């Protein structure tokens, strides 16, 4: 007949877990119940969220299996459920304190410290230039340093960086939110 409004869940920098589902599409808007359980660990239980959802770091286990489900009170028979690789859906905070420093007269290096995770993240940088129609991309390895080989004096560049939980400890595809745009003068 009708499908449930579904849900995407993203772990934010391994601080708390947030699942957001839009109840606007269905008639008679309702904030349905949410559940969760960790299959991987032995001696496990089915828990109720009751924090409308949100889960604290006390109940987040990575590198392992996690299952989410949504239940509506009117029709208990009908529900939803998904199987999630929690290391495939980590969306950390946008990196803070995007430090720029200038090693040589014609090349640049970029540094940024993520909030919690260091050794399991890949990065992307987009830089532009004066009058540029487009934006030039470049990927970075698990190390958090990117180098721009060619720069110009009078021209000015805009850098925005988003990290990604890939590939050493997962295969997350979605990118982080754009950080505060650090501007070169």
């Amino acid at each position: 007949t009708l499908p449930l409004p579904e849900v995407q869940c993203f772990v934010f920098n391994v601080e708390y877990m947030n699942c957001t589902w839009n109840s606007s599409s269905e008639p008679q808007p309702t904030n349905l119940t949410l559940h969760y359980w960790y299959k991987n660990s032995d001696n496990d239980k089915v828990q109720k969220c009751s924090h409308y959802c949100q889960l604290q770091k006390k109940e987040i286990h990575l590198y392992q299996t996690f299952v989410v489900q949504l239940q509506d009170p009117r029709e208990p028979r009908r529900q939803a459920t998904q199987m999630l690789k929690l290391q495939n859906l980590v969306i950390p905070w946008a990196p803070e304190n995007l430090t720029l420093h200038k090693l040589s007269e014609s090349q640049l290096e970029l540094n940024w410290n993520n909030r919690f995770l260091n050794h399991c993240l890949e990065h992307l940088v987009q830089y532009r230039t004066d009058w540029d129609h487009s934006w030039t991309e470049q990927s970075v390895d698990y190390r958090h340093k990117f180098s721009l080989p060619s720069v110009d004096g009078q021209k000015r560049y805009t850098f925005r960086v988003r990290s990604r939980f890939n590939p050493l400890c997962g295969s997350a595809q979605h990118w982080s939110e754009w950080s505060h745009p650090i501007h070169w003068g």
Partner: antibody
Amino acid sequence: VQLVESGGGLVQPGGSLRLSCAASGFIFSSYEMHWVRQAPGKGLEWISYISSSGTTIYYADSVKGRFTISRDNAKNSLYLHMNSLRAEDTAVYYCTRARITGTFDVFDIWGQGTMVTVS
Amino acid sequence: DIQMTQSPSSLSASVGDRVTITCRASQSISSYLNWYQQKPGKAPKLLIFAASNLQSGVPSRFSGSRSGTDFTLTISSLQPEDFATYYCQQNYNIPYTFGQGTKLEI
């Protein structure tokens, strides 16, 4: 209570064909789907799963970058079409569901399966 | 990923025996394991789940023990209506891996 799958019979290397699996008797929009391939002599080998409606993930190597799968909730169908077949993929194909009893998810009601041959 | 071998134990039985079929997983899966009885040319049946529990509508003769990652399926008082290959598989983590499957024979 019923999973009936149908698909093509014959194909040459590099060819293609259609595989479908019709479900009836339960709320198809809730559970998890699974596709499994049985070789003529090797045995069973699970190849792919579908997580309700959102995500789908295939096997590590056998079907890693050749087949793609999807489903339709309104029509109650689960289908994948095979591309770039080979001589070792001549097998039988199974469509089954996953049920969560407590904290456990177990395979329930397997499909009858269809034969695919290459020669 | 987690390759899951199985002791062959392809030994003849009779009308009423007590045989152990053990399939040790390479990694220590806690309690997640299913026993599938695959008839020739048909689909599996999911004899036992949770490595200790029992599926509804299944005779009580089958029983899992789980003696420290050495999962075993025991059958007492074998009947002729039970002669087929058995595959034990783990649902602990994707990708799911089956086993070689013992060809239990009369």
